[PDB]
Amino acid sequence: NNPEYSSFFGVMGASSAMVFSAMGAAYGTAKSGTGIAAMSVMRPELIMKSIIPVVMAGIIAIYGLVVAVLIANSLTDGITLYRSFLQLGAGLSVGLSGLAAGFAIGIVGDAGVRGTAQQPRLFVGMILILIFAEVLGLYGLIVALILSTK
Amino acid sequence: NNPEYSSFFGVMGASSAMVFSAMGAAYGTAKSGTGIAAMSVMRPELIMKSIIPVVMAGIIAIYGLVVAVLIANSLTDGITLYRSFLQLGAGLSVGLSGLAAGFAIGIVGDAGVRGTAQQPRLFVGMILILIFAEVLGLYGLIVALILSTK
Amino acid sequence: NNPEYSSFFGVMGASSAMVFSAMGAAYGTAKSGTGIAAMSVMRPELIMKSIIPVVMAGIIAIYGLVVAVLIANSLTDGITLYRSFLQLGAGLSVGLSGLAAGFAIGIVGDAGVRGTAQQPRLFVGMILILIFAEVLGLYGLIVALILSTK
Amino acid sequence: NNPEYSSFFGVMGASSAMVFSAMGAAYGTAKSGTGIAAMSVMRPELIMKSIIPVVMAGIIAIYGLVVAVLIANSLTDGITLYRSFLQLGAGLSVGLSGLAAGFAIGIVGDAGVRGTAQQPRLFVGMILILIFAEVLGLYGLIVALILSTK
Amino acid sequence: NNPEYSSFFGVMGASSAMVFSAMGAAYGTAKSGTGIAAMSVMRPELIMKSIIPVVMAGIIAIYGLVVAVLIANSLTDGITLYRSFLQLGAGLSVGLSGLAAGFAIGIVGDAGVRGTAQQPRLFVGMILILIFAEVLGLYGLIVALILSTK
Amino acid sequence: NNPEYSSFFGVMGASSAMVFSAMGAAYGTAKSGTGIAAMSVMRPELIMKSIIPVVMAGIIAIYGLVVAVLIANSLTDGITLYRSFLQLGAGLSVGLSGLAAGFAIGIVGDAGVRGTAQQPRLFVGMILILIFAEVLGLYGLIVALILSTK
Amino acid sequence: NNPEYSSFFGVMGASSAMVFSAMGAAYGTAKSGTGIAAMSVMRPELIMKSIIPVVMAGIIAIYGLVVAVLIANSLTDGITLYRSFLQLGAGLSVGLSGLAAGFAIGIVGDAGVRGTAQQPRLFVGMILILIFAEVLGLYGLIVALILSTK
Amino acid sequence: NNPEYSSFFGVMGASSAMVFSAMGAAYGTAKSGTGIAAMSVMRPELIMKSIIPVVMAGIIAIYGLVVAVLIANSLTDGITLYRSFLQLGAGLSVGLSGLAAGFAIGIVGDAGVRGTAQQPRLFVGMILILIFAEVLGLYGLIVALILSTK
Amino acid sequence: NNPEYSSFFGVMGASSAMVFSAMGAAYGTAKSGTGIAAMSVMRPELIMKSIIPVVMAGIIAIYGLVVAVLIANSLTDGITLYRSFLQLGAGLSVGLSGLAAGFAIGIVGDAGVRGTAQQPRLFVGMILILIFAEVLGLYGLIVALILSTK
Amino acid sequence: TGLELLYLGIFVAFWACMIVVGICYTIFDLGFRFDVAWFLTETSPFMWSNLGIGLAISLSVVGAAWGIYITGSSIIGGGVKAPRIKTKNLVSIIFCEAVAIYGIIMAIVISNMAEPFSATDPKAIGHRNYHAGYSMFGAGLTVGLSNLFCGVCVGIVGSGAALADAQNPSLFVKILIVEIFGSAIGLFGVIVAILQTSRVKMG
Amino acid sequence: IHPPVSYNDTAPRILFWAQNFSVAYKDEWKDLTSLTFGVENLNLTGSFWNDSFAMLSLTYEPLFGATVTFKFILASRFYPVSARYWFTMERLEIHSNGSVAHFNVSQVTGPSIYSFHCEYVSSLSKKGSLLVTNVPSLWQMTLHNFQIQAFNVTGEQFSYASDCAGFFSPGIWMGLLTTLFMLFIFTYGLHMILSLKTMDRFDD
Amino acid sequence: SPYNLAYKYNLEYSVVFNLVLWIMTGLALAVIITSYNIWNMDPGYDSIIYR
């Protein structure tokens, strides 16, 4: 029968899904908030429109949560070591792709908001650039949804 | 039956919840407190409102506490090893999410407070930015409540 | 008979395909997005043409996804240890080659968009040099599709 | 019944409760003590108001001491491994939470003191920020008292 | 007869043949694209001469592909541990020699392109230097083909 | 009987009670004694008063000496493995608390005398801040005396 | 008779003969190449004389290839560990002496070119200096030819 | 009967002699060469004397070569560990002594050749300083000959 | 009778005594030689006095030589671990002693030469301070001779 | 920066590996391996003792060497505009040499306690020969690292005095009080190393 | 693959196995493998088992002009430090037509929940030399791929095996803790040497 | 196999493990250090670098 330790890699999957996704959403919210704050002195109106980098960093945290809860609700003491390895893979995949999307949304957010203060046309541009970052979190999620449900 | 090391991981769980949430809430309180100090010099009226990005750093340590207490009140010598890894997962999952939310609240506080000193309209924007940081501690908590009770 | 650990390398393949491709696409999008945002101040009309480095960084994330999804649909409980290493190799080979392509797109997108905004003659030259970056991800795919099937 | 090495974890609990909280209180006193010394030249009257963050850094090592003495008085020549792990986790929990509170008291108790000499109104807010820093030691203590007595 | 935990080295060969050559071509492309972009501002006519270092980087990835495919086609279930190490040595010997060549071209491509725009006589010198840089990729392929077929 | 290697941990207890206290008192004496020397040229009368941070650092070396003597007088080849661990716990608990206190005494002795040179009213504040640092050596001594006698 | 795993060191000989020599020749070509590019602007006549440093770096890659071929043509399944160690030793002796020679060629090649640009009489001195850099590859080669035939 | 694997240390002896002597001779030649070239712009007639530092750095590579050959001429299949270790010691003894001597000849040769063009009366002194740098490689040799012949 | 590894430690003794004394004498000669070179430009007559810190560095590699030769004569195949580790203790003792003394002779030499050039009274002051450094080489010798003869 | 990234990379990689090993041997129930009892019995008492002697002399001499270059570099530099410095400030050197000498004293004292014992089975070696091996290692680290830290400390405060004594000749005789407190650390290293060493025997 | 030599007492209590078992007298060798593993005739008479002690005794009819018996002697002790019952095979005995020889096996031990496995239990210096003899002897033995379990057996199968083949031998530990100590020294040597610098300028 | 026979680790496995680990660590560091010193090399084109 299955090894007594088998659930460890499954839990590290549930954990990594949330840890690295909160790190992604944290850097994505820290850089975004920094850019919003430093921009507000010169263009106070743009703070409301310029929240969207933060809101997409939040989506990377939720892409962690969806997998961390899906894995957590899947665990059992009798878990096969193969099933735990799927969950570990799902965890590192969404977790570190969320981290990667967080790095992208962070830098794009900061530069995008500072540029938008100087040129209002940049707004539509940086929204598209953020979408091309947030989709990394989604691709992390797709792979992690697949792996958790095979 | 269950191993000698069985409760070790569940204990490192309660520890890691409290420790890494305290690291998160400490970094939050440190950066936010620096930003409040630097702001005070020319906007003393803003201090009693600018403490929000410190109150929220305090809330992340509370999310560490609520998990670490819940784990610590659910350990025993006999523990099933499976329950012990779940509790480790809860411990890392809140703990390092609190470290991430604390990173975001620290940076957003330190930038948002100085930006508000330069521009009083930023304040509602800052609360909106901070809710998308503080919620990372909450996602760490949600997962950690789930794993610790699975 | 196969050992119980056998599926671990294979799933770390699926993870590595998506993780390192997201880290590649992230650096690619972050440096490109900085370039676009900084140059929009001088030549707002060039932001739309300047998206291409972002889009091609996005395509590295697709090469990660393709291999991670192919590994994740090829992986199983009974997987022979040979095929599990082949999947690890496919995962690293697209993953770290997509990381290398991401570095190339990031540096070239930034330097290329900045050069283009100073001098609009560069754009066609930048597209050629971007294909010579983007194709590293496609070589990483070519080798990973072979490895995962032979 | 119990391993003769069993006390090692409980011993490193008692040590770590102290060491990390003394590192926290030392950093807290180094930073805030530099703050007071460099401040005092311009404002010789503020020393006995601004000692408060040094007093709170001193209390961090009391949190470590309370747990360390509680663990030390709970050692015995063949302790059950469960209680020895609890004593390790208790010791790290307050020790590193006290270290975290020490970082927050060190940064705040430095920055708030140079702020206070520029603007005495900051003092009322500074104490509240220092309470949100010091209470991490207390959340450390609460989790360590629960664990070390479970 | 042959052990498992053995096709691993040949797989790390095929992977490293693609990975470290993709890194080599990425540095070669990133530095050459930086030099070409910054150069094109002052000499817009020069790009289709000065693109040669980028192409001399693209070939390094292909030297990786040649070996990577040659190895991945030569992998088999139960491959003799000898053949497996020869495929690892091949894979590294192209992979890291292509990395060496990738630096050698990236550096002399950035400097050679900049110098050529300041003085057009350098172009013959630059392409001659690039032969002596690109041949390091070739020498990795030579030994790698010998090790692959020995 | 005890195991043959039993006395190693207790020997490291002596050899860390003293070593890390010597590190603490050395840094406290070197940082403070630089402070005194550079300060004294501006205020040649203040050497006699300004020795106190050095005396406080010298006390950390006395605390390390006391635990180390107590360990070294309690060691025997016959030492039960339990008491050997208690002696390592005691040795690190004082040794690294002495290091913490010596770091604080070094920083606040230097900043204390540099401030005091300009503003003699700091001298009373400095000794209070020093007592709030040197007592960390005492807290580490209290626990170390307890651990080494349980 | 002779062990499995015995060829591994012989393979790492063939690899290291190449890789480290290619790193030596890459440094030598990169560093001297940037020198030639920067010189050529002021002194267009010197380009075709100034290639000699690059040519001598090319010879370090040759010494690496010569040994790598002489190792790789001397591997077999049954290799006595003695012959395999001799091949590792050979591959490190030329590989790293070629590296040393290459590091010297790069530094003396650049300094020698920049000096020759300002003062053409240096060129004979630059060759004599450079002979003593390239001959380190030859001495590495001699020791590798000797070892690989013991 | 001599253990298997014995020849490895002796081989690493012969290699270390040559490799670390080349590393020393290379650094010695790189710094001396830089000094000759940066000097010879202003006093070109000094070249013929100024090469002597490079010749002494080349002699270290001969000390490496002599020992590496004398070691390799004393390898055999089934060498006794005593002689194989004596050969490792002989290898490092000349090898890293030559490395050290290479730094000394390099730093001396650089500072001294540049000093000599400012002040011709330095040269009769710099030679003596270089004899005290070169003799380290000779002492490395004297020990290595002794060890390799017991 | 003896463990087959036994003669290793004494060989690493002989290596360390020569290598770490050459590393010491090299830095000592490099710092002192740089000092004499930079000094000579203004005070060329002072060189033959200023060689003292150089010859006192060269002497450190004679103390390393004396021990390494003593160890090399003291080695035999039949050496017990006791006689072998004594010879390692000798080797580290003179080795790191000469490596330390050689750093003080270097740095004191490099000051003491410029200090004598700009202030001729310091010449004996340097020599005294160098005798107090060069005796550190003799201490590492005296114990190393004691350990090799024990 | 460069070398510090290498030391960081070695350090973090090593402790990351030790986390993964310490997890994996625990979770896989392989804690019968990692037997620190084998490690602390198979690693010969002779090795611990001779590293102890070698670090006792050497780390003390490293402490005296940083002592001598830290104070010596400033004595010379300040002496340019004040030649008298080379009299008085030689006492900061004499204290650094005394830190080396605490090294040679204890390294000889430990040396004259270590003897061969003609055995290799841990039961035939017996607790005595191990307690000597460990105690002579710990004594060696205790004198060695205490003298390292003492010698850097007297160097720093010796440089202190020497730069003060450039500008005002009355300061040196008073700043010496911190060199007495610095020197106590070397002698406390000695006292503990003596007490550790005092109970050993081998044979 | 040959079946193990079990000892049976209501249930299997000892399991013994080798890929080859061979012996010599006066340095002349014989196979025992085909006389031993999976053989019904194998004379275990006078073998014994107890909850803390076990003795596998194998007797042979044709060897060396004699009836010959090999005893494998094993014990299980409560190792107080580690609390698990560890076992060791402490000695081997050879009994001849009228004489006895002894071998001490040095390293054969593990927790009693696990079997012990090594590539060789042998007296020959080439084969790990685990069979120490404290005095000269006419006999030699070799077990290739030796595997034993004399406690907590669970049917015909061995439990998991604690191999002799650990990552670090004693000689390696001393080699590393020498080298990776003096590499701290060498790295400091190079830290200072690589921090050597030379002036960019000189006086008038 | 039917009886749970062990993974047959050889003697000298400690030796092969440490030879291979320390050689591959040494050669991985020698490559990473060399590759770092070439990657983060100052290309020194000071006559043109400003342009």
Swiss-Prot record, chains A, B, C, D, E, F, G, H, I:
Record-stated family: Belongs to the V-ATPase proteolipid subunit family.
Intervals, Cytoplasmic compartment: 29-50, 110-126
Transmembrane segments: 6-28, 51-71, 88-109, 127-147
Keywords: Cytoplasmic vesicle, Hydrogen ion transport, Ion transport, Membrane, Synapse, Transmembrane, Transmembrane helix, Transport, Ubl conjugation
Keyword match Transmembrane: yes
An annotated Gene Ontology molecular function: proton-transporting ATPase activity, rotational mechanism
Membrane topology field: Multi-pass membrane protein
Oligomer status and interactors: V-ATPase is a heteromultimeric enzyme made up of two complexes: the ATP-hydrolytic V1 complex and the proton translocation V0 complex. The V1 complex consists of three catalytic AB heterodimers that form a heterohexamer, three peripheral stalks each consisting of EG heterodimers, one central rotor including subunits D and F, and the regulatory subunits C and H. The proton translocation complex V0 consists of the proton transport subunit a, a ring of proteolipid subunits c9c'', rotary subunit d, subunits e and f, and the accessory subunits ATP6AP1/Ac45 and ATP6AP2/PRR.
CC terms in the record's Gene Ontology section: clathrin-coated vesicle membrane; membrane; proton-transporting V-type ATPase complex; synaptic vesicle; synaptic vesicle membrane; vacuolar proton-transporting V-type ATPase, V0 domain
A Pfam family it matches: ATP-synt_C
Gene3D superfamilies named among the record's database cross-references: lithium bound rotor ring of v- atpase (1.20.120.610)
PANTHER family in the cross-refs: V-TYPE PROTON ATPASE PROTEOLIPID SUBUNIT (PTHR10263)
GO terms for biological process, alphabetical: negative regulation of autophagic cell death; positive regulation of ERK1 and ERK2 cascade; positive regulation of Wnt signaling pathway; synaptic vesicle lumen acidification
Subcellular compartments: Cytoplasmic vesicle, Clathrin-coated vesicle membrane; Cytoplasmic vesicle, Secretory vesicle, Synaptic vesicle membrane
Name recorded for this polypeptide: V-type proton ATPase 16 kDa proteolipid subunit c
UniProt note on tissues of expression: Expressed in brain (at protein level).
Organism: Rattus norvegicus
Side of membrane Lumenal, spans: 72-87, 148-150
Curated annotation (Swiss-Prot), chain K:
Glycosylation sites: N8, N20, N43, N50, N97, N104, N152
Entry PTM: N-glycosylated.
GO cellular component: clathrin-coated vesicle membrane; endoplasmic reticulum membrane; endoplasmic reticulum-Golgi intermediate compartment membrane; endosome membrane; membrane; proton-transporting V-type ATPase complex; synaptic vesicle membrane
GO biological process: cellular response to increased oxygen levels; endosome to plasma membrane protein transport; intracellular iron ion homeostasis; osteoclast development; regulation of cellular pH; synaptic vesicle lumen acidification
Places the protein is found: Endoplasmic reticulum membrane; Endoplasmic reticulum-Golgi intermediate compartment membrane; Cytoplasmic vesicle, Secretory vesicle, Synaptic vesicle membrane; Cytoplasmic vesicle, Clathrin-coated vesicle membrane
Tissue: Expressed in brain (at protein level).
Keyword Ion transport: yes
GO terms of molecular function: ATPase activator activity; small GTPase binding; transporter activator activity
Keyword Transit peptide: no
Keywords in alphabetical order: Cytoplasmic vesicle, Endoplasmic reticulum, Glycoprotein, Hydrogen ion transport, Ion transport, Membrane, Signal, Synapse, Transmembrane, Transmembrane helix, Transport
Cytoplasmic compartment residues: 187-204
Chief place where the protein resides: endoplasmic reticulum
Membrane-spanning segments: 166-186
Protein family: Belongs to the vacuolar ATPase subunit S1 family.
Task performed by this protein: Accessory subunit of the proton-transporting vacuolar (V)-ATPase protein pump, which is required for luminal acidification of secretory vesicles. Guides the V-type ATPase into specialized subcellular compartments, such as neuroendocrine regulated secretory vesicles or the ruffled border of the osteoclast, thereby regulating its activity. Involved in membrane trafficking and Ca(2+)-dependent membrane fusion. May play a role in the assembly of the V-type ATPase complex.
Protein name as it appears in the record: V-type proton ATPase subunit S1
Species this chain originates from: Rattus norvegicus
Source organism phylogeny: Eukaryota, Metazoa, Chordata, Craniata, Vertebrata
Swiss-Prot record, chain L:
Residues spanning the membrane: 13-33
Domain of life: Eukaryota
Protein name: Renin receptor cytoplasmic fragment
Ranges facing Cytoplasmic side: 34-51
Annotated source species: Rattus norvegicus (Rat)
Name of the gene: Atp6ap2
